Amino acid sequence: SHMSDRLAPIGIFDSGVGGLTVARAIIDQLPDEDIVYVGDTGNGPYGPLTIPQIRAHSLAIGDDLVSRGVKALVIACNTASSACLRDARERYSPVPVVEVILPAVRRAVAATRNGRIGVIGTQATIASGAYQDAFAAARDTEVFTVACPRFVDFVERGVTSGRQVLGLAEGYLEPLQLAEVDTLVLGCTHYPMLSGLIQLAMGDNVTLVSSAEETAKDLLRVLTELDLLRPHPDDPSVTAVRRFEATGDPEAFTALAARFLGPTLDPVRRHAGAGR
Amino acid sequence: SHMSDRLAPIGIFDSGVGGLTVARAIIDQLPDEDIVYVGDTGNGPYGPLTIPQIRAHSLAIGDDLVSRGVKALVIACNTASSACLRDARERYSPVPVVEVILPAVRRAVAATRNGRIGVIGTQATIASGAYQDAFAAARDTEVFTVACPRFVDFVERGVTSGRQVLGLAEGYLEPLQLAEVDTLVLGCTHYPMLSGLIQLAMGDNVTLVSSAEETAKDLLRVLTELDLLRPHPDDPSVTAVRRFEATGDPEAFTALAARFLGPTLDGVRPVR
Numbered sequence A: 001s002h003m004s005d006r007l008a009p010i011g012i013f014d015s016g017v018g019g020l021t022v023a024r025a026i027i028d029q030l031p032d033e034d035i036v037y038v039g040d041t042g043n044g045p046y047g048p049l050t051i052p053q054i055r056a057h058s059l060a061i062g063d064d065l066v067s068r069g070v071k072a073l074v075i076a077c078n079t080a081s082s083a084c085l086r087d088a089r090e091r092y093s094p095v096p097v098v099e100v101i102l103p104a105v106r107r108a109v110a111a112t113r114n115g116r117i118g119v120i121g122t123q124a125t126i127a128s129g130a131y132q133d134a135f136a137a138a139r140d141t142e143v144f145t146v147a148c149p150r151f152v153d154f155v156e157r158g159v160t161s162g163r164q165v166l167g168l169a170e171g172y173l174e175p176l177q178l179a180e181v182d183t184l185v186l187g188c189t190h191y192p193m194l195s196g197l198i199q200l201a202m203g204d205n206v207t208l209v210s211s212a213e214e215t216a217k218d219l220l221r222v223l224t225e226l227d228l229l230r231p232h233p234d235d236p237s238v239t240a241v242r243r244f245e246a247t248g249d250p251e252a253f254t255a256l257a258a259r260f261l262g263p264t265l266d267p268v269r270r271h272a273g274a275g276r
Numbered sequence B: 001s002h003m004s005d006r007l008a009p010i011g012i013f014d015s016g017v018g019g020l021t022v023a024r025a026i027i028d029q030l031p032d033e034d035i036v037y038v039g040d041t042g043n044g045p046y047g048p049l050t051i052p053q054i055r056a057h058s059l060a061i062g063d064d065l066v067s068r069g070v071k072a073l074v075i076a077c078n079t080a081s082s083a084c085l086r087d088a089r090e091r092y093s094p095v096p097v098v099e100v101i102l103p104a105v106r107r108a109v110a111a112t113r114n115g116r117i118g119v120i121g122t123q124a125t126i127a128s129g130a131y132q133d134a135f136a137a138a139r140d141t142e143v144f145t146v147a148c149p150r151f152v153d154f155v156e157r158g159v160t161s162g163r164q165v166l167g168l169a170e171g172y173l174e175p176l177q178l179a180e181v182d183t184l185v186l187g188c189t190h191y192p193m194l195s196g197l198i199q200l201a202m203g204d205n206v207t208l209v210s211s212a213e214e215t216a217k218d219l220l221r222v223l224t225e226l227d228l229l230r231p232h233p234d235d236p237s238v239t240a241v242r243r244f245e246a247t248g249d250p251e252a253f254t255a256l257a258a259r260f261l262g263p264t265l266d267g268v269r270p271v272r
């Protein structure tokens, strides 16, 4: 029924742990929604892969989530979305698909002043033509794209300021500076963690657009116009059920998740057993 | 000459728990930095108070953090910032002061297409004239300001979508819609939690500017320029020391902090 639709969880999937930037932004906007997040740590990263390989891995997860019963499917990974942008809507219909490319593209079109827009992302994302095709539907805009393959490594290791990563960013970004873009889509789950460094390299006249923020807001809009929001609980002891799944080692998932989740705030020892 | 130790922590303070949006954004950008966060839950909220009241509460905490040796001071609270924007830098010099009004103001000036910019925030923030003063250098710019006092309540109770809060937002935001602003400064710690609802109310053309995000990037720039970044540890078992203090009830602080920090590793346990 439509009521049972409102009660289903939101499915989110990503190539791995970086998609938690999208999950965290969604939870910020939609605290009442139940969440199932799947990170494909056992088969990623997707960045360096071919389109057939990316589709095989990511559509297996999306098919599974939809088979399990989600009210909406969020493709949090820019690389996975780039590989199935043209067919995921029909593949999962009538389940709404919210993904990370189009909300940022739409925002960037509205946000540019000079009509010259840059996109950065993984190799597979940029090579796929997905952003290029999406921006083709925008009058009076020109798009320029750059792949930044080493950014994911730097983010996961926690090196997101200082001279070394600035030099790396400068090398990648120079063609966008030469093209005089005034808007830059952060087309990768990991790049919100580099926004300060990228802003330093691009200067103050370049508007950065976060995939996580625009997708989180887009999901709220989509659920609102479909009347699919989970009703706010009257009992304040009721809180959302959020489940996190890894296809690789869960301990490695946990260790890397601290890069993307909020900090833990700053514990008696006891021997556990059934003998007392 | 003065002591400015890159190994010392960054001090962040706020009227309460809402400033964790700023602390979270800073930590996103600067994972290696030690942090001391103070939220004035024992004396806030600041929104409905007078300027002498806001200054007395917030400068007490700022003075404490600086006396404790922080290498940089972040005023995460838009209301506190509005009350001491004119004198905080001089008061704490030579300790760098980064706050939440100026970086978003500079961004909004760059971001507008039609030159019409809105600002929303607490009563005290909007009445202070601080944003009007910050925008005084903006040419070919018209600025419109609106106070949204009940937004803080709705954010803290987690009511940030649906018909009731949309109607609240429309009542506040109508003067900005009539002014046809195309850029909107979220001039309050709590308002990033309403960005989806506010974007709905304002339409898809309006660029929202987050104070937390622009201030986090500005701190990275400032620490970089001053050669003040704490170095990346070579042993990755070494992690940043982060302390979070409240002037009010500490259990109440911990409970409300979840609204702004999101799920954390204390509770997340992944399955295979």
Ligand SMILES: N[C@H](CCC(=O)O)C(=O)O
Pocket (backbone or CB within 6 Å): A014, A015, A016, A018, A019, A044, A045, A046, A047, A048, A076, A077, A078, A079, A080, A121, A122, A125, A152, A187, A188, A189, A190
């Ligand atoms: N999640 C991927 C980044 C990591 C990967 O290459 O798998 C993306 O957003 O493009």
Ligand SMILES: N[C@H](CCC(=O)O)C(=O)O
Pocket (backbone or CB within 6 Å): B014, B015, B016, B018, B019, B044, B045, B046, B047, B048, B076, B077, B078, B079, B080, B121, B122, B125, B152, B187, B188, B189, B190
């Ligand atoms: N921290 C305040 C919001 C809460 C309060 O009124 O104290 C601000 O940013 O304006």
